[PDB]
Amino acid sequence: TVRMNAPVFYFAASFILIFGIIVIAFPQASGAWLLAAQNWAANTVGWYYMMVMTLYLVFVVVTALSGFGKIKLGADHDEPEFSYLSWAGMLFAAGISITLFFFCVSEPLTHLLQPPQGEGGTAEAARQGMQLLFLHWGLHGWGVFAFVGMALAYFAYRHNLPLALRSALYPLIGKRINGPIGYAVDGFGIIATIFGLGADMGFGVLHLNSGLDYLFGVPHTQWIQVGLITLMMGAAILVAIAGVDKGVRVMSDINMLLACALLLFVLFAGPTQHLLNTLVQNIGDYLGALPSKSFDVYAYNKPSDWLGGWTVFYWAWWIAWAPFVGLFIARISRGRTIREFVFGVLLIPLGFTLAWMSIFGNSAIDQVLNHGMAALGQSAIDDPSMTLYLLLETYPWSKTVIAVTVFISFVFFVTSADSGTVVLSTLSAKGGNPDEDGPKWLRVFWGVATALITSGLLFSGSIDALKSAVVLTSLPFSLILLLMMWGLHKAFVMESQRQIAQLYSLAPVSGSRRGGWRQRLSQAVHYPSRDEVYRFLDQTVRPAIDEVTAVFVEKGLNVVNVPDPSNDSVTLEIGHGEERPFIYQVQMKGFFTPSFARLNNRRYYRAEVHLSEGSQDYDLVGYTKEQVINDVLDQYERHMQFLHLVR
Amino acid sequence: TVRMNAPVFYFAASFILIFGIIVIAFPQASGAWLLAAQNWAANTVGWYYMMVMTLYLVFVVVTALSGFGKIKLGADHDEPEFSYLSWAGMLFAAGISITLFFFCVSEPLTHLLQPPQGEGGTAEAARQGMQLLFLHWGLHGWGVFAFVGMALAYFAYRHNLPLALRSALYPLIGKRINGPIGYAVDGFGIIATIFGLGADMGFGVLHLNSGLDYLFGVPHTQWIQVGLITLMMGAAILVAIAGVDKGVRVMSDINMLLACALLLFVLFAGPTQHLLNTLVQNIGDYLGALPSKSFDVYAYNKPSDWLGGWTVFYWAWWIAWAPFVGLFIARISRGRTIREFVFGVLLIPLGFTLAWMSIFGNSAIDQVLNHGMAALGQSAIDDPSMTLYLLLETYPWSKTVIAVTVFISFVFFVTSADSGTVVLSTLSAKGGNPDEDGPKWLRVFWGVATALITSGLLFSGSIDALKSAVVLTSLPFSLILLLMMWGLHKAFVMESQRQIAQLYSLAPVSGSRRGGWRQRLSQAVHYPSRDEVYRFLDQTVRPAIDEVTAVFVEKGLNVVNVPDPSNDSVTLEIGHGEERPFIYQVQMKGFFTPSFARLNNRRYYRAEVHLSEGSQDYDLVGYTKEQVINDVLDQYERHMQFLHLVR
Amino acid sequence: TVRMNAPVFYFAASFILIFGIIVIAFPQASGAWLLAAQNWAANTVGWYYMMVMTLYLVFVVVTALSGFGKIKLGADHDEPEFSYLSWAGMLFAAGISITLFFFCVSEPLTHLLQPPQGEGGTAEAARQGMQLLFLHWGLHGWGVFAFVGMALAYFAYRHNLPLALRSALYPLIGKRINGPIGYAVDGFGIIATIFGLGADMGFGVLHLNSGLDYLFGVPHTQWIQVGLITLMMGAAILVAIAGVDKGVRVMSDINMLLACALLLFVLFAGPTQHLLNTLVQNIGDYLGALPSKSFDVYAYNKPSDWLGGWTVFYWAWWIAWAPFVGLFIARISRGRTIREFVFGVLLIPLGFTLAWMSIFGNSAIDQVLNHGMAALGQSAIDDPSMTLYLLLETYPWSKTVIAVTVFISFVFFVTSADSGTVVLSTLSAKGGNPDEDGPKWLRVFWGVATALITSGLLFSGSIDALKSAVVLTSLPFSLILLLMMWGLHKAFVMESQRQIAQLYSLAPVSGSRRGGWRQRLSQAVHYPSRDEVYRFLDQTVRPAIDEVTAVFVEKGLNVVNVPDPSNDSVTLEIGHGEERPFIYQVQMKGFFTPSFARLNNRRYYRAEVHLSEGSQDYDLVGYTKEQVINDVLDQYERHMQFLHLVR
Structure with a gap:
């Protein structure tokens, strides 16, 4: 019978509540205190993030390319319960939200005019700023989701341990994982998730406010955003506390067909030939630059603050999102091998995301360079949440396409922040049938706790406070992610020698006669x-x-x-x-x-x-x-x- | 008993004949119509060729580096019938012709003075134009021959299917391959071969005309070329209709010893030290630039027509040559494994070709940069078939070496366009013993059909018409080459599980007592x-x-x-x-x-x-x-x- | 019973003695004759070294990454006799000497001011000159030690052959290795070792002379160096002829703790943040540039003499050091597999060496660029053995740290040139128990023979004569190193088929009933x-x-x-x-x-x-x-x- 697990609930909620309250009470002081911490972290712990982010990717690739890639996640008579497309669709519509719509157009236009090195406005800056976009949304981000999912599925389907974060610490500390050492591992993983989920509603509130201000005459005041958060969250709580399907498994197919139509419209209503050429150019650039761009910190240039706003923020973001997407995809992948799990996570979502980013970015670089649109390139630096609507209003039937974009981007948030609450409530509960979720009074709690975090950072320097609050709270989880790797390596070597001991024991000699x-x-x-x-x-x-x-x-x-x-x-x-x-x-x-x-x-x-x-x-x-x-x-x-x- | 296969003969000959005739009748209109199609294709389908040309190479390398590389092409008691050197020599003297002599000297001198990006005449243009020469004659070209050969040998020696192109479509459409769907696959593969073989006699006619005009006073008129095609083809038909050995297997050893003496003369009669240094420099440049140069379409530069005359022409060329070299080398490779077939095709011919290209190209770059020879660098742009004789006349005994070069280059054509007719006639016949060739009245037909194609494009803007006619007729075969890959993957997964089912069935329990x-x-x-x-x-x-x-x-x-x-x-x-x-x-x-x-x-x-x-x-x-x-x-x-x- | 092996002793000592004597007698003529040979070799055999140095690395990596990597060096019931840290420490404190202290600071300052290509003094020269330092002290050097060690351990622990260099030529010439063909292979490997060991005492004599001239008022005269060689060698002979432990196995732990304290002091008493950033930058630069930098000979630039003093000297150096470190580490590695031997040699010493080089090089680049110290950057070009003491005198308690550096660098020489004599004497002896060393009157001989070689090249143009004498005597050993590779490949294919023949022979049918x-x-x-x-x-x-x-x-x-x-x-x-x-x-x-x-x-x-x-x-x-x-x-x-x- 699932019930609350008090040493985790009281350790997480207490940390969340007073932070929220004292950020609500003193906005001027907190807004100034966060910009100091951002500048400090960018310079002091910049090398550490770059070092730890490549270990996960190398680990998962080397594991899937070796003899361990033939191990089935389950028993030998287990079979998959989902098809391939229905699996990949649920996989894609979990780690994608409105941040894609926030960053698709305004980030390349920023790297084109303000490069980290060189003179901007040229055709070399345009080629250099499209490699950063592929680095920030490519293999590094999807390589940690696969790591966490494959580490959680193994211990739960081959050893009959619970489906939690502390189970990967079993080969190290035995069954002391049910004491005070597991209650901290499982507790430091709710804080990261809460902050990474509350920083995503703030990036959507601004997008929607600009989208409504374009069509109607709605201003950018504060009660508007306060009343918009309520609508964004009440639709995600009422879906979590009223059902699962027509939802978790149906929306994954509904929105995947909404996205493709818009992508094809944008491709076929613009310069199709130029886009088809640059799509193939970008892939080669990325694959050629990958091995040396993973360690670039610009150490021989004049000091600056570029790294803490672009490249360190993204790694902190993916690390904060990992413990949720991993635990969601480790529940629908029973009966598969490790190789077809890794190469299935690193195939379809990566392709769709890179195609989207490339088409939408080159379609705007082409208009700022070749057609002379300076008012489009200035808002990308001043007002970064109106650039998409300035680009889209140069197409046929623009007022009918913007109204459909505003609606399509709204379900992308509800598709993710409803499995968010489900995972976050099944992570704070104890006992019960493994394939069974926690109580549905914790979803209503974890949903209300995130709006309080979001609308304390919106009113304290909206964008930079959101960017700076994620880099701090994701630091203690990067070490747990290394302890998990150590434990998984021990568990792998403990059973590489179990296949030797089963072949050598087949009919050594006769004597039964x-x-x-x-x-x-x-x-x-x-x-x-x-x-x-x-x-x-x-x-x-x-x-x-x-x-x-x-x-x-x-x-x-x-x-x-x-x-x-x-x-x-x-x-x-x-x-x-x-x-x-x-x-x-x-x-x-x-x-x-x-x-x-x-x-x-x-x-x-x-x-x-x-x-x-x-x-x-x-x-x-x-x-x-x-x-x-x-x-x-x-x-x-x-x-x-x-x-x-x-x- | 081998006889004609009418639904293929009448489908191919009818397409060939009227094209030849209406290009013979209206030269002014066709010469103008071909230069439009070249410019159209270069811009519209440039990305497609670059994408499909890397799939073949990645496929064959990954297949040879895995557990499938230990599968023997035949039965387990089969043994190779040829030695290693006698095998590699026949392998090399099939996919090499007079185009090597046409392009060895004039292509680097063109890339040095008219680079695709930068200012020409420098020492950076000289280093950049020697990587394009290694890209155009390197692993991409030899990686499709291996693919086609390994796909044809498998289905014919492990499944007892005929040795034809339609057999690789067996795992997809069953034995419907003997109906109207195989008769189109086998028909679209004769047109590509005919055009790729008729574009090679035109590159040799010009070379020989210049070589004779240098020694004697023979002009560049039209009856000279008409009478030269006759001599080039009558020596290749009379060898095909009079015997096989003293020929297919003896010439492969005769010409391989003619080439090495000339290469060593050119190496030891020039600046040996400079050449030995640049040979090692070029290998490192190529291996470093390979992964990012495979997708380069120059998408951020000002539009131009460079890609359709150099990089797209070469892929179209190799694809048009694949169905002949593959089917010729799949007949002498019975009893070998996949790994030693792939690593044997990608070892010796690649080395010899790259050594030839590097020595002959640097020996002329050194004279245009360092010794001030502008008349040598101008003819490479104006008159591209006299540059070799201008370079060779700065050596000891030049009039005695040019006369030997003109003779050595003549057997390189007869060695290839006599297995050309053999394969082209065994591809249009039906029934009979598998290791047995078709009737020898089809060789006399397919030999005469190629001169008609060659001397319709020579009289319509010689070089550019030849280059433009190959890019069009090789487009429908690139898709059949993907269907074959799909079928081969299915056939591989269908027998990866046949080894599991043979180990698990060994003595499960006793009971025979x-x-x-x-x-x-x-x-x-x-x-x-x-x-x-x-x-x-x-x-x-x-x-x-x-x-x-x-x-x-x-x-x-x-x-x-x-x-x-x-x-x-x-x-x-x-x-x-x-x-x-x-x-x-x-x-x-x-x-x-x-x-x-x-x-x-x-x-x-x-x-x-x-x-x-x-x-x-x-x-x-x-x-x-x-x-x-x-x-x-x-x-x-x-x-x-x-x-x-x-x- | 171990005794002298006359056909090797008399072949090596006779070559050594007259060279030493006639270099002692005529210094002016020999100093001029060596600078001609250096310039000749740099230009004539530069490509050969670059080609052969990559074959060893590719061979060992491909061998360890394949199915041969699971072969145990010994019998199946053998177990390792050392721990992992005690093994890696002895492995590290064998191929490190005072040359590290000679080259740590003065080489990057030379590449910063006199680049092989470009304008020096910039921030691009600083980034380019830190890749050469990583190339010269990275994987290429440690990849030949592993090759020689793994080739010697296999034939000695799996075939019960002696532990010598001629054993790898057994699969080629049978047991003719006990005749005149093995006596030349084992003889050409003592000359290389003697020269590579005598060029290392000359690099230490200058370091120590400068270190004493800084503290006290000791001049740079000739009797000072003559009396310093005596002290450097009498401490290494008396340790070899008086005991083994408190020594070979204890010093390896004593000095490994002296080095780390100095490294940590230099890291934490300077600009820690800058150093932590540049350490991570350098790794990415090296890994990105590795595949194309292995073949760079600067073939399109104006001729020069840069390659013969920097990149060819280092390969000659590592090749001359291989036959000693390999034979020393093949004696403490019984009972391990090939994979954990290769990945154990390529893990810890590489890391420590690269960390040392990076910290010590960037700590001085930072002071020449950013703080304006020209007198530090001028001595790196004029007087290259005083730069370290000029850098170290800008720290707290400098006179107390220089006195500890002078003492720490002195045991680094005694730790290597005492296993030097042991290996060199066990290589010139015949018969006896395999795990047992030769007589201890040969150590006193081979120790005295090296001072005679060192103080004949010090008095003939000290640094350049030392650099030039190693490039010549290491040329005939590079071919023996290829014959050994051929023999090892034959021995590997001869037992890949011994596992097939042991599985197929398990219970073919019944009949014992x-x-x-x-x-x-x-x-x-x-x-x-x-x-x-x-x-x-x-x-x-x-x-x-x-x-x-x-x-x-x-x-x-x-x-x-x-x-x-x-x-x-x-x-x-x-x-x-x-x-x-x-x-x-x-x-x-x-x-x-x-x-x-x-x-x-x-x-x-x-x-x-x-x-x-x-x-x-x-x-x-x-x-x-x-x-x-x-x-x-x-x-x-x-x-x-x-x-x-x-x-």
């Missing part, structure tokens, strides 16, 4: 003592090795005997001219008696058998002398077939 | 009904599972019984403290009776056996109760050896 | 004649194949008989509708009788059995007719389980 299911059963639970095996080596093994070789010598063969200095080993050897000889060596060894056996025994011995390289080891305790001679013979005949094939 | 070759045979063709297995589970399996466990409990072990809610499953379980337990579960399941069994049965059942992960599944229908207890025992003893190795 | 250990033994050494098998095929195999199929036909199955044209093959076939049929074909074949069998037999025959693709081949000579029918039945039942799984 001796018969007797009652005498073979009593012998299968006995652990012999030290010199009890010594009464086996000299009564059965010694009188046989010296007896089978008698027929060998007087039958044409060269049998190399040695004096025995070991008192336990019984070796036999035969030379075949120049190539490899025939080793057959028995040897006693002792081990520790297992737990489920102790009478206090504490020690036992086994008489192994070794051969040439690439063989198996097995014991003969319980054989009969006539069965030992029949074991050295079919190991010799197996040797003669080996020698026939190498030549 | 029961004896009786007549009673074991009658049982091996029976398909039991539903409740007939129910009369097996309760008479043999239930009275045994509850009977073998009796000895277990009263012998020190923790045997976990469960009430049975399934009415068919009979589960047994044992705990070993903390590590993995011992699952042994039987379960009934039903399948569809196969085709070769139906009395109308239509349905049958089997009683499988499942264990822990990584095991095999098998049925017990036909066991004896004493044989079932002896099967749960040696699966338990196999479990205890597994537990001993993990610890 | 026939019983009789005395009759099964006599049959296991018989080689049948030609028509003796013919009296088996017609008495046992023919009357059975035609007898088992009788039950098949009249039991509902389609059995396809064929007339027999072969007179030896006995084929059986069954169609199953459309999918694969059941082939069971017997066939006679003859082979050559092995060596250890010849009565002169010289020939014998076997009756193999073939099936569908992916099967094993075995003979039936010695079966009974009732055992042959029972073999075709359980191959048919194994076929029906295969067909059930593919569908």
Whole structure:
């Protein structure tokens, strides 16, 4: 039965509430305190983000390209419960929101006129600013979602652990994950999600306010935004507390067909040929620049504040969004292998996002360079939420297309911030059936808690406060994301050696022909003592090795005997001219008696058998002398077939 | 018995004849109509060629670097019938002709003085124009020959299908490939070959005319070229209709020793040190620029017509040459693996071609930059077929070396356009022994049909008409080349799972000790009904599972019984403290009776056996109760050896 | 018992002695003769070094990334005798000496002011000159040590050959390696080591002389250096001839903790933030430029002498150091796999070296560019051994830190040039226990022989003579390093096929149930004649194949008989509708009788059995007719389980 998990709820809500309240009470001081922290972080912890963001991508790619990529996330008789398109659509319509509409047009126009290095307004700035757009929305962002999803699905479907963030710390601290060390890991992952989700409603409120101010005469006042947040959130709470389908699985197909029509309209109502050429140019530029652009911090230029507003903000953003998209996509991916999970997450959404960004960015670069539109390029720097409507009003039927864009962008928010509440409430609950969600009084709580965070940062220097508040609260989660990687590596090496131990144990020798299911059963639970095996080596093994070789010598063969200095080993050897000889060596060894056996025994011995390289080891305790001679013979005949094939 | 295949012959010859005739009749109009189509194609379908040309290379490399690279093209007892050098020589002297001699010197001198971007005449233009020469004659061209050859050899030597182009469409449309859908695939592949072969005789006629005009006083008139085409083709028809060896296999060794002597003369009679340095510089430049130069269309520069005369022409050229070289090299490669086929096609010819191009290009760049020869650099732009003889006349014994060059370049054409006719006639014939060629009245036809195509484009703006006619007729074959890739991928995944199904079927359990070759045979063709297995589970399996466990409990072990809610499953379980337990579960399941069994049965059942992960599944229908207890025992003893190795 | 190996000792010492003597006698002529050879080599054999240095790296990486990377260097029951940190420390403190202290500061300041291309003093020269420092001290240098170590460990621990350089030439020339062809391979590898070790004491004598001249008033005269060489060598001979531990294994831990404290002091007493940023910038620059910078010879620029003093010297240096570090690290790496050896050599020392170089280089670039210190940047060009003490005297407590640097740099030399003598004396000795070193009168000899080489080049144009003498004597060893690669490739392909031949030989068929250990033994050494098998095929195999199929036909199955044209093959076939049929074909074949069998037999025959693709081949000579029918039945039942799984 799902109920609240108090040591997580009270640790997260208490941190959220007073921050919200004291940002609501003192706006002038907080707005000034945040711009100091942004400048400090940009310079002090800029290298750290760039270093940690590439480790995740390299890890997931190397894991999917190796032998571990054939491991099924589940049992061997499990099958996928969704189709491929219905899976990819739900995957895409979870990590996309109105920020795409906020950044599609105004970011390239900013990098064209104010480059991080060089003189702007040229055709080199236009080619350099379209690589930054591909870096910020490319493989680095989608490579951490796959990491978190694949780390959560493994431990939950192959080890029957709960579906939570603290489970990946099991190979390190055992079952202490149900104490005070898991309650902090699961608690630092709600704060990042709340801040990354509340910074996304603020980027949508401005977009919608500008869209309505363009059509009607609605001003940019404060009660307008206060009443707009209410409408944006009441539609997302009432969908979460009233049903799931006609929703989570239907909207994913409804909006995916709304987006494609608009993309095709923009492609076929403009300069189609130019766009088709630049789309192919951008892919080559990105693939060529990828390995050296991942570490660029502009360390030999004059100091500046460019890195903290563009490249560090985006990594903080993706890291804050990871623990939600990962836990949502780890629930619909049962019965798949690791390789087709990774290459399925890194194939379709990446393609659609890059196509969108490239078409919408080049369609505006073409008009600022070639057709002389300075009023379009000035608002991208002054008023960044009206540039899209200035570009779209140069098309046929512009007043009918803007009204459809304002409506299409509104469902992109409701599709994400309704699985947001579901995941955020299933993360704060304890017990119950694994494939079953938490109580539906926590959704109404986590929905109301996000508007309070959003409309405290909107009234404190809207855009820069939103950008600066995410870079701080996403810092303690980057270390948990490394502990999870360590644990996953240990769990992988612990089962790379479980496949070796299952092949080597297939029919080492015969002996079942001796018969007797009652005498073979009593012998299968006995652990012999030290010199009890010594009464086996000299009564059965010694009188046989010296007896089978008698027929060998007087039958044409060269049998190399040695004096025995070991008192336990019984070796036999035969030379075949120049190539490899025939080793057959028995040897006693002792081990520790297992737990489920102790009478206090504490020690036992086994008489192994070794051969040439690439063989198996097995014991003969319980054989009969006539069965030992029949074991050295079919190991010799197996040797003669080996020698026939190498030549 | 090989005979004509009318639905292909009449579909190809009819398309060829009227085009030839109406280009012969109206030269002024056709010469003007072709320069419009060239400019149109260069701009409209430039991105498409660049996209499709990289897919083939990536496909073949990834296929050869994976587990599929160990598949032998033939049966497991097949052996290669040729040596390695004799194989590589025939491979090289098939896709090389007089175009090498036409483009070796005049293309770098053109890229040095008229760069696609920058100011020409410098030492940066010289370094940039030697990367284009390596891109146009490098891995992209040799990567499609390997693709077509490996796709044709697989379906013909592992599935016993004919050696034709339509066979790769078998996994898609079944045996409808012998209808109207294969007759178009095999028909669109003769037109591309005819045009790509007729554009190569025109590049040789000009070379030879200039070579004779240098030595003697032969003008550049029209009857000279008309009478020269006759000599170039009558030597290639009379070799095809009079024999094969002293020819296909001897010329490949004769000309390979003519080329090396000339290369070594040019290397050791010039500035050897400079050439040895620049050869190593060019390799590094190419390998560094490869990943980003594959998608370069110059999309941010001022519009121009450079791409349609240089980079799109070369891809169209290689695509038009693929269906001939591929089908020629798929006939001499029986008994090899995929990896040593791909890495053998991409090793020796690439090396020789790149060495030739680099030495001959740098030897002329060095003289235009450093020694001030403007008359050599002007003819490369005005008269591009005399530059080689202007460079070669600055060497010792120039009149004796030019006469040997004119003779060496003449056999390079006869070595290729005599396997051309052989392949083109074996592609238009039907039936007969697979390793056997079509009738030798079709060679005389396809040889005469190519001169008519060549001397209709020579008299219509010689060089540009030849360049423009290949870009159009090679467009419908690029899509067939993608359908073939789809079919090959399906055929690969259909047999990746045939190796799994052959390992899992090795000795699942014992039972042959029961004896009786007549009673074991009658049982091996029976398909039991539903409740007939129910009369097996309760008479043999239930009275045994509850009977073998009796000895277990009263012998020190923790045997976990469960009430049975399934009415068919009979589960047994044992705990070993903390590590993995011992699952042994039987379960009934039903399948569809196969085709070769139906009395109308239509349905049958089997009683499988499942264990822990990584095991095999098998049925017990036909066991004896004493044989079932002896099967749960040696699966338990196999479990205890597994537990001993993990610890 | 270890003793001298005269054909190597007398071949090496004789070459060393007269060179030393005639360089001591005529300094003016030799100093002038060496600067000619340097300029000649730089221009004539510059491309050769660049080509051969990348082959080693590509070879080792491709070998470690493939299936050969799982081969253990030893026997399957061998275990490592050292920990990981204690192993990596000994690995690092063998190939590091005072040259690090000589080149850490003065090389970047030289590349900043005198670039190989461009204008110096800018922020582009500073970024370009920090990539050369990473190229010269990066993967290329550590990739040849791994190659030599992995080539020496394999042949010595898996084939029981001596631990010497000539053993890798065993797969080529057999056991002629104990004649005049191994005595030259092992002799050309002492000269390279002696010269590379004597050029390292000269780089330390100057460093120490400057360090003492800074503190006290010691001049730069000649008797000072003569008396300083004595002190530098008498401390290295007395440690070699008095003990091993408190030394080889303790100093490796003592100095590794001296280095880290100084690195951390330099990092935390300067501009920490700038250094942390540039450290991350340099890694990306290096990884981006690596593939094209490996072949750069500046072939399109004006001729110069830059390449022979910087990039060719470093490759000659690493090649001359390889045969010592490789043979030292191949002695402490028993019981490891190839992959964890390669990725262990290419992980820790590379990281420490690159961190040191980056911090120490940027800490001085920052002061020459940003703080205006021209007297620091002038001595880097005039007097290159005082720049470190000019940089270090701008820190707190400079006179107390310089005195500790002078002491720390002195043990870095003694840690390397005491395993130098050990390896150099175990390389000139013959016989004895493998893991046992040569006599300790050869260490006193090889130590005295190096001072004579060092103080003949110090007095002949100190720095340039040292740089020029290494480029000449390391040329004949680069070819032996290619012969070793060829031999290693042959040894790898000779055992890739030894794993195939050990899987295919596991239980081909049954027959041991026939019983009789005395009759099964006599049959296991018989080689049948030609028509003796013919009296088996017609008495046992023919009357059975035609007898088992009788039950098949009249039991509902389609059995396809064929007339027999072969007179030896006995084929059986069954169609199953459309999918694969059941082939069971017997066939006679003859082979050559092995060596250890010849009565002169010289020939014998076997009756193999073939099936569908992916099967094993075995003979039936010695079966009974009732055992042959029972073999075709359980191959048919194994076929029906295969067909059930593919569908």
